[model samples]
Target chain A: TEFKAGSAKKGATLFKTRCLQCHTVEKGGPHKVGPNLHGIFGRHSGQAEGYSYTDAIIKKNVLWDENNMSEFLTNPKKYIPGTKMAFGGLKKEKDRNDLITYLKKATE
Target chain B: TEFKAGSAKKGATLFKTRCLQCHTVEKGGPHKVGPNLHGIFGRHSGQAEGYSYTDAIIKKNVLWDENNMSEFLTNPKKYIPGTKMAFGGLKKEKDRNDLITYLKKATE
Candidate 1:
């Protein structure tokens, strides 16, 4: 299996510059343009409490994990058609890896 | 007295074009790049429940109305000093008026 080790520190910087405008990762953080990202891994998709997700996302009964997150972060629109996430996916594999790593540590 | 009447229809269009990426006005809408704007006309600034506001905004201690919203929408940084709203202010008076008009009706 192809592997990319991630660093939480580097991921935090990437998240701030690219994702902070729309997403927050703190526990009990309010939803931004996107949903609060705390503890996203292992949770079912589109199930954040107090958040209103699109019908398409609500119908997507899937679990979140590193492998799926990598694919989704690589191409949000392609992965989930009609998703409200407007971000162009991260082009770098290392960045995605690091971001997911940071999310795991921050949310857990 | 200088006055500009606003159009809710036009404001809705403008909101989608400019603000929808970061905000939602529907009741029970999820927070976006900024906070949810439902019923914002009479609410205090930075007091939306379930959302985190900047310290500067929390300390602003002002009410939301057409006047304050117009000024803030016109120049967010200038009005608030250190707000998280990253977009530049709306330059057209008509646009701002129409947006507020739309918000009043949509939120009501």
Candidate 2:
């Protein structure tokens, strides 16, 4: 599905408020506590070029997908223990989906 | 009619942002340059005991009501010419209504 542009704009605002402290989306945007999200979609889990990975994350061995992203966001600790994503889960399903759609479009 | 308590709570926040500098709702809140709003709804214009009156406001004998307030806030200086309110007034209709609800509820 194509990116819903308006929804992406709204999602961008939400991302800036909630996620920007740790995650950076655009190329050259500083990656603080997490990896740069320049091309996270479809990239192998736990391996962003030149980035060091924890043993637990390196062993995750999965492709990033909508369902996977949803699961990961539902509870980061349950999704990958010792993976240092400090975010508490996104609670509202629609907001999570909108954010996912926005991210997916950003990567493409 | 009883106030919508939750909406009034939200309205209190709106009041603080938009009106607190000129209008104090609580009985003992500091009266700024404008006449205090301790019990303004039924009050005549430009008269809150011990507060100085502006000739323009004193001349316009308004009783604060929803319709009057809505019209006043939509454009303040036009409502009572030369009144030294100095307030630019609340802009959004819902915020105005909510604040009115809060103040109405508060005085009782």
Q: Looking at candidate 2, what is the lDDT of residue B35?
A: 56
DockQ, per-model, please? 0.01, 0.01
Instruction: In model 2, state the lDDT of residue A37.
Output: 84
Interface RMSD of each: 20.3, 27.8
Candidate 1 per-residue lDDT, tens place, A1-108, comes to: 122559989988998998999999998889978999888865667999988898877666445656567888898888888889898999889899898878767877
lDDT for predicted candidate 1 compared with the true structure: 0.80
* TM-score leader: 1
lDDT for residue B2 in candidate 1, whole number 0-100: 22
What lDDT score is found at residue B37 in candidate 1?
88
Weakest lDDT window of 10 consecutive positions for candidate 1 chain A: A59-68
In candidate 2, which residue ranges exceed 4 Å CA deviation? A1-6, B1-108
**Model 2 interface root-mean-square deviation:** 27.8
| CA error at residue A6 for candidate 2, angstroms | 9.0
lDDT score, candidate 1, position B78: 94
